[PDB]
Amino acid sequence: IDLEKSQQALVQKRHYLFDVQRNNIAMALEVTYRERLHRVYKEIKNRLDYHI
Amino acid sequence: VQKLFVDKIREYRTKRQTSGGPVDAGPEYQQDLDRELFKLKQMYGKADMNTFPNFTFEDPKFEAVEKPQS
């Protein structure tokens, strides 16, 4: 019973690490997205801020 | 004192005849407006007139995990 349930609960542990990998790389790519937009949003004010 | 009311408007109109900024600046207004123009740029930054944002970002490299299992 245990050697059956050792492989049973293992494959539910194998699929947990692929849910965690699929959202981590999807989010860590996404955190650089608006941060690329933020710096251009930053720079377009600073050239306006210098003139005013 | 409406006789003083006319006499500070009429010597305000004389100031409205201007050619190049200050009337009696000399070395005074030329040095001060240049000393102050640096200080609005000195601790602020080096910025041109119209240059857009020019850069490039690199994201985190997605490494893999090795796992002999079962």
Side-chain angles (χ1 to χ4, degrees), chain A, chain B residues 1-23 25-27 44-45 47 53 60 64 68:
Chain A
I1 287 166
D2 53 61
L3 294 166
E4 178 57 77
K5 271 130 173 182
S6 88
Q7 325 303 132
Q8 175 176 355
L10 183 48
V11 304
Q12 264 60 36
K13 288 193 190 190
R14 296 303 172 186
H15 94 277
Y16 277 165
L17 193 143
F18 288 123
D19 285 331
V20 175
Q21 197 188 353
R22 75 184 62 174
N23 56 35
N24 280 10
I25 317 292
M27 280 206 274
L29 268 291
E30 260 187 30
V31 77
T32 307
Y33 186 44
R34 199 193 288 171
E35 198 169 7
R36 281 159 206 250
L37 308 166
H38 275 159
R39 195 173 167 185
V40 191
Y41 184 91
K42 182 264 296 176
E43 202 272 333
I44 206 78
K45 314 302 174 333
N46 214 330
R47 295 302 169 97
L48 174 57
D49 182 274
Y50 187 87
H51 271 303
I52 63 181
Chain B
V1 280
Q2 206 149 305
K3 300 290 103 177
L4 211 166
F5 179 46
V6 307
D7 285 345
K8 278 185 73 83
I9 291 189
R10 286 184 203 178
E11 282 185 353
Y12 160 68
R13 286 171 173 163
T14 306
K15 182 61 176 65
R16 269 193 39 83
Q17 306 322 109
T18 313
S19 67
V23 172
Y44 184 71

